[PDB]
Write a protein that binds this ligand. Structure first.
Ligand SMILES: [Cl-]
Ligand SMILES: [Cl-]
Ligand SMILES: [Cl-]
Ligand SMILES: [K+]
Ligand SMILES: [Mg+2]
Ligand SMILES: [Mg+2]
Ligand SMILES: [Mg+2]
Ligand SMILES: [Mg+2]
Ligand SMILES: [Mg+2]
Ligand SMILES: [Mg+2]
Ligand SMILES: [Mg+2]
Ligand SMILES: [Mg+2]
Ligand SMILES: [Mg+2]
Ligand SMILES: [Mg+2]
Ligand SMILES: [Mg+2]
Ligand SMILES: [Mg+2]
Ligand SMILES: [Mg+2]
Ligand SMILES: [Mg+2]
Ligand SMILES: [Mg+2]
Ligand SMILES: [Mg+2]
Ligand SMILES: [Mg+2]
Ligand SMILES: [Mg+2]
Ligand code: NA
Ligand code: NA
Ligand code: NA
Ligand code: NA
Ligand code: NA
Ligand code: NA
Ligand code: NA
Ligand code: NA
Ligand code: NA
Ligand code: NA
Ligand code: NA
Ligand SMILES: [Sr+2]
Ligand SMILES: [Sr+2]
Ligand SMILES: [Sr+2]
Ligand SMILES: [Sr+2]
Ligand SMILES: [Sr+2]
Ligand SMILES: [Sr+2]
Ligand SMILES: [Sr+2]
Ligand SMILES: [Sr+2]
Ligand SMILES: [Sr+2]
Ligand SMILES: [Sr+2]
Lengths: 46, 194, 237, 119
RNA sequence: GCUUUACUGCAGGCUGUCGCUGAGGACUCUCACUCCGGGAGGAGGACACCGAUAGCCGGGCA
RNA sequence: ACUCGUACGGUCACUGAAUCCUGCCCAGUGCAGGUAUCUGAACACCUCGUACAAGAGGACGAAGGACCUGUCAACGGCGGG
RNA sequence: GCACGGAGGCGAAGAACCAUGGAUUUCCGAAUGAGAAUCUCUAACAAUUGCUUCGCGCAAUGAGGAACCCCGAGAACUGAAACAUCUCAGUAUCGGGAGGAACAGAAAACGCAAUGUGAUGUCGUUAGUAACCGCGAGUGAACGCGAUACAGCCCAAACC
C-alpha cells in the first residue's frame, strides 16, 4: 500500500500505545495494558 | 371618501373582468418565464399588502412564488397495503398551496421571516402568491412599533411551525368554538386528528 | 412478479445504454444564413460506429470541418454545396422546394432546420414526388407518402452502404460485435423460457404462452408483450 | 398602457408640468395617488396628472374612469419621477392633482382643451 | 412465492366533460399555449400539453 | 433510456443451421377494423319536486359492448357416429 | 491528579486546594478560499439573503442539544377469534423548525335559551355520557361546573 502522512501519524500512535505498562506504575498502584495489539492477530482501523 | 386602495381591492374581487383581466393575461406571460421565487420592488395588490402589515420601509421585502397546480404528487406503495392505504391519485396533501409558497420564499431568504402572503392568480398549471418578508435584523424594523414584534427569537422560522395567518387557518384555528375541539391549541397535542 | 426486461431498459442503466462516448457525430445539415454561398470539399471518408455505414468529412470555405451524412458515390476531393442555389448533384443539400421532382434524396428534415430526420440508414432513400407552394410530397423508405414543408432540407442521392443487410451474420459472434456498438441488450432469452415470475409467458410444464399473444394497446407496461395491438397475425388470408 | 387610451405629445406634456410647477408655488396641488383620488371624489380637482410608467398598474387604473364620471380633466406623463419633481417632490409620484391652480388657470384651461381635442 | 374469466381494490391506457381558453352541428381567425429555428421567422392553435372528474379496459400491482 | 439512432431502423414476441416442406378450422377466447339500429357516465340542458337544496324523471350520447368483418408462423382445435 | 514508585522539585516572595473573572486554546469538524479518510494547494463570510457608502463595507442564516414542543410525511404485525370498512393508530418510523419551555389566546364565542357566561392553556369532573360503527369488534368528545393562573392590547381604512 501507500500511506499518506496522516495515515502514518495514526499508525505511529498505534505503535506507541502498543507498549508495556511501566513497572513503576506497578509498584505505585501496588498491583496490564488492555489495549495490547499484535500486528498479526489484530486489525487496526482505517 | 373612498381610498385609492379600495379601487385596487375592488378590481381584484373579479380578476377575470375589466382591465385587471387584460393585465393578468399580459403579466402571466412574463411570470411563466420567471423563476420559482422572484423578489419584487412593489406589491401587485397594494391594498392587500398594507392590510396584511406591509410598509414601504427598509427591511420589508416582497417576493412572488409560483407552485405547480393540482393534488398530491405521491408515489404508489411498494410494500403491502390494505385497499384503504393503496390510494394514490385522489389523495391530496394537508397543506394548501399558499403555505408551500410561503415556505419556499422563506427558504430563498434564510435571514428573513414571513409576515403574510396573498394570492395573485393562477393559470391552468400553477398558482402565484406574493409573500411579505421582514428583516428582523435591520434597525429600521427593530424600531417599528408595528413590526418589531417579529424580531423576537421565538418568531424565528415562524412559517415552518405554522405560525403564519395561512398557517393558522390551515390548522383549523379560525373558529373559537364548535369544530375546534381537536385543532386548538395545536394539532399535535390533540393526537393529530384535526 | 418481477419487472420484465422491457421495464429494466427504461431505467437507462449501462447494460442498456448506447456507447455514446465512442460515437463520432450527429450528421446534421449545416446552418446557412442564406445565399447558398457555402461549399466545402470532401477531405476523407470514415466509418460511423453508430450506423455501420460510411461518413464523409467535409472542409467548408469558412473553415468549418464537420462530418456529413454521405450518400453513395461521394469521394475525396469532390466538392459539395449546401444552400438554396446549390447545384442539383449527388451529395448536395438544399430545401425540397429547389429539388426537382422524381429525385431520390436522404437525410430529410422533418421540420425546416432540424438537421435531418428521415432516410439516414444504409442504402436507403426517400423519393421526392410532388412539389407545390404549400407542401412537398415525399415517399419515405417504408413506402409512406409524407407531406413536408417545402422548406425542409435534404441531400440528393441515396445513403451510402446499401446492401449491408444482404449478407447473413452467419455466426453469433458477428452479431455480438455489432450489438456491442448499439444501445441493446443481446442475446435474447425467449419469454416462454422464463419462470412465471419473470414474464407473462413464463411458467408451465412445457413451454408455451398460457394466453393469446395479441395484446391490447391499452395494456400497462409489464403486460404489453407479445404481438402489440396486431391488426392481424400469421401469413395466411 | 391598459389605462392609457391616447398618446400625449412630448410638447403638451412640457407645458403641463411647467403649469403644475407654478401651480404648487401659486395655487394648490395634491401629491400622491390617494390624495389625487380624493380630490376627484370631493370634486376639488381641476387637472389631474397620471404617470405612465406605474408598476403595478392597478395603482392608477381607476383614475381615468373616475375622472370622466366627474368631469375632471386628466393628462398622462411619460415619467414618474418628473411628475414627482414637478409636483415639488424629492421622490416620484404616480399621480398628481392641481387642486385649484394659481396664475396658471389660463394655461391649465388650454391644456384641458388641447386634450379633449386629442380625444 | 406463483396463477387465474376467485373476492376486493390500486396503478396504467383509452374516452367524454370542466378549468387553462381568446376573436369572428358544421366553420374561419390569432392573441394565450405548443413545436421548429442561432436569429428573423416558420408550423400549429384555442387544439395539444397540464390540473379535475366521469365511463370502459385493467393479475401490470396490492 | 432507446438516441451523436430514423424503416437496410429498433422495439415486442415466436421458431431455432442447411435441405424438402409447412394441410384444414375465425365457432369460443385474444387483437384489430367497421358499425344503420340497440345499449352506454358525468358536466351543461329540459320537466316534476323544494320560496332554495336534497331527490325523481327526460333529452343528448364518447370510448366500450351488442352486431358485422379481418386475422392461426394468435391462444388453441383437427372427435363420436 | 486517578496511582500506596524512584529521583528530583515547588511552597512564609503564603504553594496545594476552592470560587469568580481573564490568558493561551494545534488539526478535522456547520466548517465557510480551493481540494483532501484529520492533510495539502494559492488571500478568502463558501453558499443564500437583507441593508448598502454597491466595497463582503455592515449584518443574518447553516450545526448541536436527554427528552419535552410546533409544522409536515405516515406503516404493518395486531384486534375483529377468517377478512375487505373498522382496529392496531395519526402509533413506529421519516422530512422541516423554535424555545427554556413550546403551541394557544382577547369571540363573526357560548346556546345549563338566559333579566345568563365572558381571551387562552392546563388539572379534576362532566363521561365511556352525546356522537360514530360489517350499528359487529371497537372508537369517543363538547358546553358547563370546581380549580390553577389571570391581562389585555396593536394595525388596515376613514380624516390628516
Ligand atoms: Cl419565516
Ligand atoms: Cl442487427
Ligand atoms: Cl354559561
Ligand atoms: K390491516
Ligand atoms: Mg518498538
Ligand atoms: Mg399608531
Ligand atoms: Mg446526425
Ligand atoms: Mg454492450
Ligand atoms: Mg432466444
Ligand atoms: Mg426454467
Ligand atoms: Mg406474471
Ligand atoms: Mg413450444
Ligand atoms: Mg421448443
Ligand atoms: Mg425544445
Ligand atoms: Mg396477487
Ligand atoms: Mg431449444
Ligand atoms: Mg476549510
Ligand atoms: Mg383477525
Ligand atoms: Mg399544549
Ligand atoms: Mg364478525
Ligand atoms: Mg380513534
Ligand atoms: Mg359545546
Ligand atoms: Na493485521
Ligand atoms: Na427565512
Ligand atoms: Na414461498
Ligand atoms: Na375462432
Ligand atoms: Na480552553
Ligand atoms: Na456569516
Ligand atoms: Na458586499
Ligand atoms: Na384471530
Ligand atoms: Na389469516
Ligand atoms: Na366501521
Ligand atoms: Na350550574
Ligand atoms: Sr490472519
Ligand atoms: Sr433556522
Ligand atoms: Sr439530431
Ligand atoms: Sr440540433
Ligand atoms: Sr407459460
Ligand atoms: Sr395459412
Ligand atoms: Sr420611487
Ligand atoms: Sr430448418
Ligand atoms: Sr375470432
Ligand atoms: Sr380573566
Amino acid at each position: 500500500g501507500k500511506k499518506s502522512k496522516a495515515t502514518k501519524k495514526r499508525l505511529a500512535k498505534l505503535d506507541n500505545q502498543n507498549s508495556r505498562v511501566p513497572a513503576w506504575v506497578m509498584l505505585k498502584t501496588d498491583r496490564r495494558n488492555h489495549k495490547r495489539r499484535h500486528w498479526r492477530r489484530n486489525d487496526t482501523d482505517e | 371618501a373612498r381610498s385609492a386602495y379600495s379601487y385596487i381591492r375592488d378590481a381584484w374581487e373579479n380578476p377575470g373582468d375589466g382591465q385587471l383581466a387584460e393585465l393578468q393575461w399580459q403579466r402571466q406571460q412574463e411570470w411563466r418565464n420567471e423563476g420559482a421565487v422572484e423578489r419584487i420592488e412593489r406589491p401587485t395588490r397594494l391594498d392587500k399588502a398594507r392590510s396584511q402589515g406591509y410598509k414601504a420601509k427598509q427591511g420589508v421585502i416582497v417576493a412572488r412564488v409560483s407552485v405547480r397546480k393540482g393534488s398530491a404528487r405521491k408515489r404508489r406503495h411498494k410494500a403491502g397495503r390494505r385497499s384503504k392505504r393503496q390510494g394514490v391519485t385522489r389523495i391530496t396533501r394537508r397543506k394548501d398551496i399558499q403555505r408551500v409558497a410561503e415556505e419556499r420564499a422563506s427558504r430563498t431568504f434564510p435571514n428573513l421571516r414571513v409576515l403574510n402572503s396573498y394570492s395573485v392568480g393562477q393559470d391552468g398549471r400553477q398558482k402565484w402568491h406574493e409573500v411579505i418578508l421582514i428583516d428582523p435584523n435591520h434597525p429600521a424594523i427593530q424600531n417599528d412599533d408595528d413590526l418589531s414584534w417579529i424580531c423576537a427569537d421565538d418568531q424565528a422560522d415562524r412559517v415552518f411551525r405554522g405560525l403564519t395567518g395561512a398557517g393558522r387557518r390551515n390548522r383549523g384555528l379560525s373558529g373559537k368554538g364548535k369544530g375546534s375541539e381537536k385543532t386548538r391549541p395545536s394539532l399535535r397535542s390533540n393526537g393529530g386528528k384535526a | 412478479g418481477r419487472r420484465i426486461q422491457g421495464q429494466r431498459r427504461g431505467r437507462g442503466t449501462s447494460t442498456f445504454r448506447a456507447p455514446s462516448h465512442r460515437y463520432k457525430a450527429d450528421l446534421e445539415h449545416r446552418k446557412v444564413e442564406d445565399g447558398d454561398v457555402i461549399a466545402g470539399t470532401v477531405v476523407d471518408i470514415e466509418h460511423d460506429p453508430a450506423r455501420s455505414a460510411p461518413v464523409a468529412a467535409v472542409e467548408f470555405e469558412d473553415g468549418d470541418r464537420r462530418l456529413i451524412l454521405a450518400p453513395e458515390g461521394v469521394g475525396v476531393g469532390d466538392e459539395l454545396q449546401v444552400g438554396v442555389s446549390a447545384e442539383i448533384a449527388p451529395g448536395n443539400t438544399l430545401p425540397l422546394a429547389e429539388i426537382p421532382e422524381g429525385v431520390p434524396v436522404c437525410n430529410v428534415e422533418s421540420s425546416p432546420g432540424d438537421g435531418g430526420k428521415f432516410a439516414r440508414a444504409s442504402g436507403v432513400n426517400a423519393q421526392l414526388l410532388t412539389h407545390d407552394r404549400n407542401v412537398a410530397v415525399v415517399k419515405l423508405p417504408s413506402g409512406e407518402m409524407k407531406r413536408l414543408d417545402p422548406q425542409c432540407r435534404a441531400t440528393i442521392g441515396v445513403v451510402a452502404g446499401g446492401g449491408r443487410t444482404d449478407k447473413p451474420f452467419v455466426k453469433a459472434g458477428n452479431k455480438h460485435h455489432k450489438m456491442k456498438a448499439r444501445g441493446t441488450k443481446w442475446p435474447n432469452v425467449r419469454g416462454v423460457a422464463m419462470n412465471a415470475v419473470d414474464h407473462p409467458f413464463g411458467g408451465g410444464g412445457r413451454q408455451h404462452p398460457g394466453k393469446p399473444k395479441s395484446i391490447s394497446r391499452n395494456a400497462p407496461p409489464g403486460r404489453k408483450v407479445g404481438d402489440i395491438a396486431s391488426k392481424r397475425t400469421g401469413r395466411g388470408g | 398602457p391598459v389605462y392609457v387610451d391616447f398618446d400625449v405629445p412630448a410638447d403638451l406634456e412640457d407645458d403641463a408640468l411647467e403649469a403644475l410647477e407654478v401651480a404648487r408655488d401659486t395655487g394648490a396641488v395634491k401629491k400622491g395617488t390617494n390624495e389625487t383620488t380624493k380630490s376627484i371624489e370631493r370634486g376639488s380637482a381641476e387637472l389631474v396628472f397620471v404617470a405612465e410608467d406605474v408598476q403595478p398598474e392597478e395603482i392608477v387604473m381607476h383614475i381615468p374612469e373616475l375622472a370622466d364620471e366627474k368631469g375632471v380633466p386628466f393628462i398622462f406623463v411619460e415619467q414618474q419621477d418628473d411628475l414627482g419633481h414637478a409636483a415639488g417632490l424629492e421622490v416620484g409620484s404616480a399621480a398628481a392633482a392641481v387642486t385649484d391652480a394659481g396664475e396658471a388657470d389660463a394655461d391649465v384651461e388650454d391644456i384641458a382643451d388641447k386634450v379633449e381635442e386629442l380625444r
